[PDB]
Amino acid sequence: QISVRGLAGVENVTELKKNFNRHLHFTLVKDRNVATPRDYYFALAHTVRDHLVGRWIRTQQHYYEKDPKRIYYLSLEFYMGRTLQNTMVNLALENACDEATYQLGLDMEELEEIEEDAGLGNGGLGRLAACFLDSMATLGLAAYGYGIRYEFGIFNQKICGGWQMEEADDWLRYGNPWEKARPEFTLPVHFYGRVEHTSQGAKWVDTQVVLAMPYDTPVPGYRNNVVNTMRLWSAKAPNDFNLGYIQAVLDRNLAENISRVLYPNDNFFEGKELRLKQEYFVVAATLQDIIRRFKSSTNFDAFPDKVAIQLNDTHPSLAIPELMRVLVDLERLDWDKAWEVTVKTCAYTNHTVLPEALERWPVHLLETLLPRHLQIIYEINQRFLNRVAAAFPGDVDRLRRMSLVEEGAVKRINMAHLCIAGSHAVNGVARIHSEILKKTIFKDFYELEPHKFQNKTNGITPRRWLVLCNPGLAEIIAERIGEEYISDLDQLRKLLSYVDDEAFIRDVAKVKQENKLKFAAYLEREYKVHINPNSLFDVQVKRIHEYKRQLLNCLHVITLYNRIKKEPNKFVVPRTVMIGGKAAPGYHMAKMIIKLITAIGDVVNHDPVVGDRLRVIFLENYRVSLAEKVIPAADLSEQISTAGTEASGTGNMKFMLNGALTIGTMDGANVEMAEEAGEENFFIFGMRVEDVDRLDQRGYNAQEYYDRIPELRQIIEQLSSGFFSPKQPDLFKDIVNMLMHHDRFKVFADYEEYVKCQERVSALYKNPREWTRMVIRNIATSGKFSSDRTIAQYAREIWGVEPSRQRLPA
Amino acid sequence: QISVRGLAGVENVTELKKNFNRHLHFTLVKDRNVATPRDYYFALAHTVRDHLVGRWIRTQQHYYEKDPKRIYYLSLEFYMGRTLQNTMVNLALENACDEATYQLGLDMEELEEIEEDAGLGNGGLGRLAACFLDSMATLGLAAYGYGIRYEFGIFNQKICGGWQMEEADDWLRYGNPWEKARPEFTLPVHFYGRVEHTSQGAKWVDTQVVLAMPYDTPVPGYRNNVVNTMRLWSAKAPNDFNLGYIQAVLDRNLAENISRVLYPNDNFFEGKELRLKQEYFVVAATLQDIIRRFKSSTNFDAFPDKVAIQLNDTHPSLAIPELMRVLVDLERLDWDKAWEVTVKTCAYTNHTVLPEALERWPVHLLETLLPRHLQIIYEINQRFLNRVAAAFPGDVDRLRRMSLVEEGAVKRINMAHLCIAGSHAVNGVARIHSEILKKTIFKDFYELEPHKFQNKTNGITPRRWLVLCNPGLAEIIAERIGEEYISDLDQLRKLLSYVDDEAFIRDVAKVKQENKLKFAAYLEREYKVHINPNSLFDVQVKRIHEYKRQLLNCLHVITLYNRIKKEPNKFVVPRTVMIGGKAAPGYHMAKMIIKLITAIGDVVNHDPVVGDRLRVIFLENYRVSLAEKVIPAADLSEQISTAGTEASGTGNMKFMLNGALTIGTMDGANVEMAEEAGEENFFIFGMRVEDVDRLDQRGYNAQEYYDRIPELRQIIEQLSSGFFSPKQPDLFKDIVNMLMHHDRFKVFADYEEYVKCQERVSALYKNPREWTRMVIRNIATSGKFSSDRTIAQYAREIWGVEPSRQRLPA
């Protein structure tokens, strides 16, 4: 049907239909008489999977023969979403499968909706890992993603009476056709026990053993016949475990709980024992696998030449002392040699500066669970602080600030400090964030070892986030500039030549309208909610957090409503305001924000005076599959974090690629996006980082803003008095109190500039042609934000390997 | 190679090799370079499974079209063993697969050893269910086995320092290629809650819900293209379950524990809540499935015309009040009508008369877990006792004896009484057992409803228990009489014509010697134990229990040892005495018996004066796969239960079919075996049932035997003094005390006759030709003991259906 979706050759279509029928019969044990749409999905998935196999086996054989340096990406989160369409895209099978299924009397898009998301992450950090795997395969790197196979991923969110409710994400219920269990490569992991000192070094004895069983999932590169591996570990009890009899068998659950469920916190540290077990479990199993693979290719001097380990945040930070443990206790290397190897092998990526997100583990937990690792951490600390003392003699404050051990009521280990000490490279995820690291939280470390500190601006994969989710836009672009941009996104710059092309202007606007119609129809079908497709689609989708300021958005919505009520007969640009995202189950304020949003909708959506000029919708169960639907439909992207709080953002990049304009602060990657597109082509407002610092120095007083801004005063009075909660007048008292007395994120301080900037947005939207021309200027300059660019920089500047766009033989 | 294993045609072999290679590549994602024997097993299993599929789909379609009466066999145990060879046998693929694998450079018998047993049973009762499924498919009945998919089957037994140790049977670790998950047919099961009475009947409300997810396994008939289904339920929590957050997800284990593990008790009732939950879980899910299937073919008058439910023991007895609950509470039938349907639908098989094995559930457990079922049971009891009172007016003792409710310290429900009241047929499992039921424990019920009581003598499948485990014997038989006997075992009578045939005598003896050599080699390979293949193989394999009298066997072994030590230079027929079987983890005496056996071996096997004239071996981890190895190798089958205690036995039948002679009491099916073969061709000894009754009446005094039998006195003195436990002289004091003062099973009373009978065995073994002629007389008359005969009798006399040996189209 469309060119970027590949060829539908007679031979291929015939073969696909044959194998589809085979799987339905032999694999699913069904006939066409009793088969349901779910059976048809599975027959298609197995058919497409077959095409991955040959390439998967030969890629891994190729790495064995060539023995390139291997890259290991360690993460507690891989937010993968659905796999079927992505696999077809990367193998050039989309049109062929579409034709084959059509001839069998089936609608492929209907079958695609049956697949469960692999929701093994919380938000940005987990989704970055997923984009990275796609880019590493596309650039021909010998890369492996290592994580945990959670039985339950991020919870399914239901909205009941306007409140968030959580349901278990039982994503494996119907099976996972993509994974291959590898019980033969099961490895032991040790917990608890005690340290024994012998004539020849320390010994970790009397441990409890949990087995780590790997499941491998293929990761296809874009049309290069490369298929890499994501290996996820699942926890299993040993067979003599606890071995009255019945209870001992039932108690196997205790061991197997390690891989049961993803902790649903985003940008918030919860110091629970089970989470620490998960972190060690992934690190211990992965490192054994790494060392095994290295030996099968005596002398650890070459270890950093053949192995790179990337730590995604501090979650897998135990890799550092675990590597030391293995090299010193088991392989019998001297300390200094082991440390040299460890530092040259490991690198660390930081994703946030918010103090509450930083992992600081109580010493007493580490002492009980991982006694040998605590000893190693103490020794690392002693040697590191001896270097600091030598470099900055007499600076006793610096010694306390830089220590891995934090003194106080309870002693803690600062895992970020451990990561910096034991890594040869430390990076932030956008230029402003990397600069903040050097100037503030890691200033002391930067002064000691400046060479360690780097920037690697985040990116997103243009396969999932353009070709897959927005084929209409991909097609009109390919018509003008060909197909090479899909693996070389910088080529989108060629589109600047079409900014005054009346045909292209019309096509860009047509694609957006079709996307909006499709999404408007999706909402009525699946959720019974009515929206006007001619309105400006104003969208903020991301996890619910105070720093992201969904609350500032709420204030603007109420402002719009109040202005309409004051002058009902004045024209206003119609808007559909959509907000979605999950709140961590224990985060009270975030749960209250969700309730506020639905409560505003309850009033606004039913006021006959408003009509269809303003609608407020809460998008339930935001996740990767939903992002693929709403992003291509958006006109306006809300990226409104307080300056200095969002390290990069990646949702911002997805919206830019898909033809939405951005309203945002100069925060994270917003700064670089505006720089690429030109500030005239962005809607920038509010305090810069320096302005926030100035306000902190004299002290933030929210009352000042309330006193001087009459429109703001009205909203707070409405919230306090019960206007949005008639039956429970004091429902939002917590929100008002926080805004007025305890607001770390200065919502009121950016209110006036935000509202004025939103007026400028509405003004441009009244002029379709000039709106679309600005859109073209954004799409055309989005190239820097491909994760292919990001990964090429990691490869060259951290891992010491060269990317390759060359095909493996088919 | 051998004829009964079918054809190895060029087309078939080529096709099998092709599909083997396909599965290795696409299914297992391996290449020949890295594949292990386990990978090769799985490639073969998937290849053979493919051949089942077409027949499986078309059999089930055939039942849908023809709508025959359906038979539902409800059991908490299905002791299936391995599936690969059985499937090849029934599909006539054995020789073809052997050739195909040989051409690929693989040994098929080596691959067969990799498969785990499906050990979803304890012993006789569970294995009977397995033989029954095979026979029902072979006789073309529309039959379904329904049970529980235990994650852990019967424990693996290890012997450490002579003691039994238990290890979890993690049989699903590497996957199960035979099953197909059917998550789409998941059904809810209710627990706890309370009963509400409305204007229109009772309502069971406020329940906890557990989901039952089915897994289907194919059951092939012998070369008739019939493939029936065994459906096993697995427990799953609902997704809103317990839905702080992390704990609620982890607590899903509580619901899912229902299907976690098989209770390892054999002939012993343990009244634990989790076991009651398992019993209701299987009954509730199964009955919904039954009713669904019935409606898809309003009026329940025809229900018993289209449905038969067979209760394997009282374990699924809750089917009776559950059927009543559904018919009365949900379908709104009047009580009397519902009861008529229930009685005509249900039938009950009793497997033991031992009082400690009878299920008597505390009322307080049923009251909390199943409040509506308790109410229904009370109502059944009231109506039943009104019938008794009308038939036997004034007989107040009879009313207390027959009540379903047992009065006392704790009130209990007698599940056997419930089963008799609510079934149209009640059967014992051998003629003597069925007679004992009518004369003793169920006498009152027999007097009220004589027509209900039947006999169905047990049997074994000649596919698994001859063709599969003893192809050598199957072949020499087929050479003389053809292949028809495999599905018509009565044809073995034709072999009486060859009792004086010198060629056949030589061949029968040759097959036994080869079997003995193979097993002798197995023991050295897998267990490093040396045995003399020329010795008489004297075998007792079955679960360890006081009633089965492994202890009597022990007394004979010590007698033999003491006689040798007294006259070292006298000739004795050399014996290898092998005893194997598992003890329930909480059964102290059974565990002590295992220790005694190993302790005897420790002395006997290392006495240089004995030489290789006597060896005592404990066969570790007795299970179906081991039975298939040891039974064809046996010369002497020990079936020595106290008369009136072993309801039938089925191990006895397996030995008779495979060319062992039997030493046994007149107990269970031993009586019918001796009758078929002729008493001259059996080694019968000991008290009959009547003799046991006489001894009970005057009182059993073990001291009398000790006083009058000098050889018995010596053994007890040896046991007491520490002869078999030098380091722990009082180790066996419990055993001695029981034998002397508290022996319910009268071990001493049969000792003298047993020893004398064993002398007669040794005498015959000295004459190879006459030994073998007696063997031929046993094999030739084993036909009655085919489970095909048993199932034909159930079909005609209980279920009201006609068996069919006719092929379905291929």
Ligand SMILES: O=c1ccn([C@@H]2O[C@H](CO)[C@@H](O)[C@H](F)[C@H]2O)c(=O)[nH]1
């Ligand atoms: O706990 C966290 C901490 C940070 N992050 C995010 O990581 C993304 C990937 O670098 C960045 O784009 C965002 F700026 C950052 O908030 C999370 O998503 N969970």
Ligand SMILES: O=c1ccn([C@@H]2O[C@H](CO)[C@@H](O)[C@H](F)[C@H]2O)c(=O)[nH]1
């Ligand atoms: O709990 C029990 C009770 C009885 N049984 C057995 O059932 C077999 C099948 O009918 C019979 O051959 C045996 F006689 C009987 O002991 C068991 O194996 N477990």
